[model samples]
Target: GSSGSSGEKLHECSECRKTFSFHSQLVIHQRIHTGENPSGPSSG
Candidate 1:
């Protein structure tokens, strides 16, 4: 039995009710609530 490749959004964000294709993406999105910005400053 072979099933075609289908991407499923198994990771869900409770803060924004958004679906992520990967767990890492979901965790990165969660930083908005934790006040942790590892992406560096956006300001000059």
Candidate 2:
């Protein structure tokens, strides 16, 4: 099987003014946009 994906940012977020490959990935990224640290322990 082969999977392909591509995107272009036609617009930017008015809140953070961030550009993205696609609106979906940008939405997922927005969920964790806060500077707050993650709850889990750190690992390298």
Candidate 3:
């Protein structure tokens, strides 16, 4: 079963109470607290 969306947001962000379909997405969201770059770049 699937909605074709990004699947379920099994992971959740405590800072904003937001959710992500992938772990990496949560990591990126955590950047809100870290102020770090959330991908958007190629592997160097």
Candidate 4:
């Protein structure tokens, strides 16, 4: 694929209004607040 901004698409959290380099992190953070369990463990 071609390059665009030359950086990762910084993912933002709607709940905390924070930024994350990976959407997985955002999903985890959002999952925490919504009381949802992610496939990955929290203690990592």
Candidate 5:
């Protein structure tokens, strides 16, 4: 973490270029690339 006039993007998704501040979220974001539904999509 650095201090400057602007904040930095710590994690950038390789598949869609999505940026995240935390590594945990970045890992979750990457799950999309593997086509694995972590949410366990709800059913009616």
Candidate 6:
């Protein structure tokens, strides 16, 4: 039985276990939970 190549999961959210194809994307997704936005007004 072959279980595909064994390699580190390409993308995954350390905070939520969400998976993605790219690390940058994962970071962005994580930001949603943290409520952070560089272009938006500061949050209080």
Among these predicted structures, which one has the highest TM-score?
6
Which of the two candidates, 1 or 6, achieves a greater lDDT against the reference?
A: 6
- Structural RMSD, model 6: 7.0
Give stretches of model 4 more than 4 Å off.
Answer: 1-8, 36-44
**Candidate 3 vs candidate 4, TM-score winner:** 4
Clashes of each: 0, 0, 0, 0, 0, 0
- Give the root-mean-square deviation of each candidate in angstroms: 8.9, 10.2, 10.9, 10.5, 8.6, 7.0
* lDDT of candidate 3 over 1-44, digit per residue (tens): 85666745498888887878787889888887877576885777
Model 3: ten consecutive residues of lowest lDDT: 1-10
Report every candidate's CA lDDT: 0.82, 0.68, 0.78, 0.78, 0.80, 0.83
Regions of candidate 1 where Cα sits further than 4 Å from its true position: 1-9, 36-44
Top candidate, metric lDDT: 6
Decreasing lDDT order of the candidates = 6, 1, 5, 3, 4, 2
- What is candidate 2's CA lDDT for residue 31? 73
Q: Please give the range of 10 consecutive residues that has the lowest summed lDDT in model 5.
A: 35-44
Cα lDDT tens digits, model 6, 1-44, are: 97978888688987889899889888889887886456666676
| TM-score, cand. 6 vs. native | 0.53
Q: Compose the digit string of candidate 4's lDDT tens values, residues 3-31.
A: 55565568888978888878888888887
List residue ranges in candidate 3 displaced over 4 A. Answer: 1-9, 36-44
> Could you tell me which residue pairs clash in candidate 3?
none
TM-score of each: 0.50, 0.38, 0.48, 0.50, 0.51, 0.53
Q: What lDDT does candidate 5 reach at residue 6?
A: 70
In TM-score terms, candidate 2 sits at 0.38
